[PDB]
Design a binder for these strands. Structure first.
Ligand SMILES: [Zn+2]
Ligand SMILES: [Zn+2]
Ligand SMILES: [Zn+2]
Ligand SMILES: [Zn+2]
Ligand SMILES: [Zn+2]
Ligand SMILES: [Zn+2]
Ligand SMILES: [Zn+2]
Ligand SMILES: [Zn+2]
Ligand SMILES: [Zn+2]
Ligand SMILES: [Zn+2]
Ligand SMILES: [Zn+2]
Ligand SMILES: [Zn+2]
Lengths: 131, 131, 131, 131
DNA sequence: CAAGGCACATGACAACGGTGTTCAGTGCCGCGTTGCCCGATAC
DNA sequence: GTATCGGGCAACGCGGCACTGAACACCGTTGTCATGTGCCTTG
């Protein structure tokens, strides 16, 4: 995820960290990892870099029920929904043509000016269910 | 809106406000409406009664971008999703058989033990765009 | 370390950590220890409690060369001075009456109506020098 | 006022401004003085040249309560402790042998390999007390 | 019907855990500059 | 042989834009203390 602005070690390090993690992680959880790495990127810098890469669309952003937003790096450039397990903290990338068609059809039925479908699935995997 | 908690004048006043407005409203906004009525239900009372109704199932919960939870009363007890306009705060109930099937299919392919899917569409109204 | 206002678990949690620690530590450093302890006090909560305890005099505060203030609970509330080992991150309490008298005499020569005398020492122990 | 860095017009201007002031001055404030003179020396250049002079020991430094760095040029080459009035912002150099001996003695019994003793006094002068 | 018996209730505070804004302070990549450094010069 | 002269010069200056460290501010939610309101047997 190349940052749009002039490259610096801190922004490059957060970009590398997003590639290193394949799970949705909040800024506080990522900043703690970078502090343990010894990179020295500040919590405020981690917030600014995560927001810039997410605005570019390089990293996907999701919100939990608690209201804490989480950011993950996605291999697929194309838009897709996600099935996420809270216990794993990891998400699966899946895209639905039918759900997208249903959202457009619902917008057509109500004559809504624009469509911004937000389909997200939250389920726990069998491995986490086992204890 | 039947409330599981012991019956009191305060619970009835907030329940009346929920029935009065179909559109999603924040707990603070509902408290302000009760203050205007003269019911003067306490903010700590409005927050507790809204949350209690939600666990019972009388009210449905949604997340505004600002991150403030909003509560509305729904006539139908069947599973449904909401097509809501952020600009006008107007919510219309929408149901799709295909979205249920797609969510079930993603859960089945990944073999997650328990899965619950939350879906909503954000669009402006044709009347709203009209000037 | 007591806080003047009504006590809560979070105020007690930061106070317990300051009593447990025998060295000066920053708000961010103390917060990471508490997060691992599972107390779950927020960084803003760590800052508000630390500042209140320091005002009471329960915890003595020293300013580091970097400029990030570090807080520690001293053995006695009596006035004293500290010699800090940078490698240890811990200090030894030593007070000189003569230095206070010297500061008072020179302050009187200055003509100051009232004066505040502060002394700090930065060094390293013989054991810390060995590597 | 010698500068370790290669001599140039900008370095001549910052050194002259430091010579003119006999009180602790913020690096940004010295830059403000230089633009007022019309020297138009760069702020980044003012910061690096002040740091080089401080490393040389030509101009002394003090850490303020806010934590910003202030630089004062001193007539006396020999070591001393600055008594800076909080109200005036001006410092009079006073040296005490006893405080140095006390710091050395406590460090020696503690067994510290090396120690640096720093003493600062802050008070309002009788003239400043007058209003 | 009213006093008791008891509970659940309320509300006003007193708190808080996120994410966002000021800073002095410092990366950076272009510029410039200065005493040195040499090659002449025609005498 | 000296000496002043033009010009190049490469290892260094400079400045402006740009971006970063902690400490601090906001805002929807509560956790903790007290008391008035509601009902049920017992009289
Ligand atoms: Zn994705
Ligand atoms: Zn989609
Ligand atoms: Zn799982
Ligand atoms: Zn509904
Ligand atoms: Zn559904
Ligand atoms: Zn609309
Ligand atoms: Zn102490
Ligand atoms: Zn003292
Ligand atoms: Zn040591
Ligand atoms: Zn000095
Ligand atoms: Zn004064
Ligand atoms: Zn001394």
């Amino acid at each position: 995820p190349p940052v749009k602005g002039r490259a610096t070690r801190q922004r490059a390090a957060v970009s590398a960290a997003l590639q290193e993690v394949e799970e949705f992680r909040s800024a506080q959880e990522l900043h703690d990892m970078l502090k343990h790495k010894g990179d020295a990127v500040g919590l405020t810098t981690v917030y600014r870099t995560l927001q810039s890469l997410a605005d570019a669309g390089e990293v996907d952003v999701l919100r939990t029920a608690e209201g804490e937003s989480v950011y993950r790096r996605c291999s697929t450039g194309d838009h897709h929904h996600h099935l996420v397990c809270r216990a794993c903290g990891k998400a699966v990338e899946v895209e639905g043509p039918a759900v997208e068609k249903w959202a457009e059809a619902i917008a057509a039925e109500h004559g809504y000016v624009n469509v911004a479908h937000t389909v997200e699935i939250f389920g726990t995997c069998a491995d986490c269910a086992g204890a």
